[PDB]
Structures are given as C-alpha cells and as structure tokens.
Design a protein around this ligand. Structure first.
Ligand SMILES: O=P(O)(O)O[C@@H]1[C@H](O)[C@H](OP(=O)(O)O)[C@@H](O)[C@H](O)[C@H]1O
Ligand SMILES: [Zn+2]
Ligand SMILES: [Zn+2]
Length: 218
C-alpha cells in the first residue's frame, strides 16, 4: 500500500509544511501505472474534505500536482460536474483564507488549461459563475495552466493528397494541415484555424476534418 502511505504522509496533521518528495512519488506511481487515476483522485478527495484545514490544504496541494503532472486520465477525474459541485460546496463552508484561495486558484487554473475542450466546459462555467457571484480569484499566471498543452505534429511527406489522393506535381502543389500534420492539396486544406491545444493562437492552415473538430471545440 505505497500510494496510501505516501498520501497519508503528505497530508498528515503533524506535517509542518508541504512534503514535496512524497507528492512527486505519488505522481510517479500514477504515471508508472501502479495506482489508477480514479482511485488516486477519490482518495485525495477524501483528504480534501478533512475537518482540519491544514490537512485539507495539503490535500489540495496533492490534487494540484497530480492534475498538473499526470495527464488526461487524472484531468478527466477533476474536470467534471461532480468535482465542480464538490469544490463549490467546499468553498461555501471554508472559513480559512488559504483554503478558499487554493480552491479558487485551482478552478481558475483548470478552467484555463481545459478551455476549448467541450467535455470540460463545466470547469470554465464554474469559474464564470463564481466570478459573476463576486468571488475574487488570485491573479492569473498563464504559467500555471500550460500543463495540458502539446506540441503540433510533425509534417508528413507523400506524393498524393491525403484526402482526395490527387497526385502532387509542379502545378498541384503541397500544403500541410498544422493540426494533424498530413499533406494536402490546396482544395483539401483551404481552412484556417487557431490551435490553442498546441499553443497556436494565430490562424493557420488546416484540413476540413481538423477545422470542424476545432470549430465545434469552440
Ligand atoms: O511553395 P512550395 O514549393 O509548393 O512548398 C510547399 C509550401 O511551403 C507548403 O506550405 P503551406 O502548407 O504553408 O502552404 C508546405 O506545406 C509544403 O510542404 C511545401 O512543399
Ligand atoms: Zn485534395
Ligand atoms: Zn488536419
């Protein structure tokens, strides 16, 4: 029961200050596959709801790290209605400022990190409604919300268009979709889109399948 010992250690009400080494080890356990994301997150959540606010805050610190460091299987456990309702309720009953601030901080950082994913829109909606209702968030640093970004794919070379298979030549020239990296003729890659996921906020050439995925993602 390594995960459980580490989580107890990291959230102890005898712990003076945050135990980063246990937290990094917990993240490694989830990344290596030794602890499954669902179980890990549910376990951390039990600690978040502890009556002692030192334990609760240490638990939120574990939650922050596992979300930042462990990928989509952990994102999917927090970026949902159930967790947003739980955090709103936890916020409502907090008296200690550092705990209230940490919850607000996380809602905001996650809302940014998960923006333009329809599945996770409930996080942005929670941020928006808390802001509307007068909750003052800590100052946002974009650096706290880059953890889900990926880089754009490498480009493929081929002698025909990936979509229509027209053969490239001197007068049928090559283009690429920045979202999938495939190679296209001009007719098949006429769309332009940003690609927030890859850090692209300029409008860049995409194919129609990628344009629609990204269009409906916005
Ligand atoms: O000007 P060309 O000699 O046809 O060169 C092509 C362009 O630079 C294309 O840019 P684009 O995707 O921005 O249109 C690029 O995708 C192709 O791979 C190149 O072969
Ligand atoms: Zn084509
Ligand atoms: Zn594409």
């Amino acid at each position: 029961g390594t995960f459980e010992r580490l989580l107890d250690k990291a959230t102890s009400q005898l712990l003076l200050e945050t135990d980063w080494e246990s937290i990094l080890q917990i993240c490694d356990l989830i990344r290596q596959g030794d602890t499954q994301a669902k179980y890990a997150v549910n376990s951390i959540k039990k600690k978040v709801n502890d009556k002692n606010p030192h334990v609760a805050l240490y638990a939120l610190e574990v939650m922050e790290s596992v979300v930042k460091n462990c990928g989509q299987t952990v994102h999917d456990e927090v970026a949902n209605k159930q967790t947003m309702e739980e955090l709103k309720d936890l916020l409502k009953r907090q008296v200690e400022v550092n705990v209230r601030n940490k919850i607000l901080y996380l809602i905001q950082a996650w809302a940014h990190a998960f923006r333009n994913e329809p599945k996770y829109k409930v996080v942005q909606d929670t941020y928006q409604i808390m802001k509307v209702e007068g909750h003052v968030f800590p100052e946002f640093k974009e650096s706290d919300a880059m953890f889900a970004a990926e880089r754009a794919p490498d480009w493929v070379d081929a002698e025909e268009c990936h979509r229509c298979r027209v053969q490239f030549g001197v007068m049928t020239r090559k283009h690429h979709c920045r979202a999938c990296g495939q190679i296209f003729c001009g007719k098949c890659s006429s769309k332009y889109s940003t690609i927030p996921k890859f850090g692209i906020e300029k409008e860049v050439r995409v194919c129609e399948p990628c344009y629609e995925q990204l269009n409906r993602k916005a």
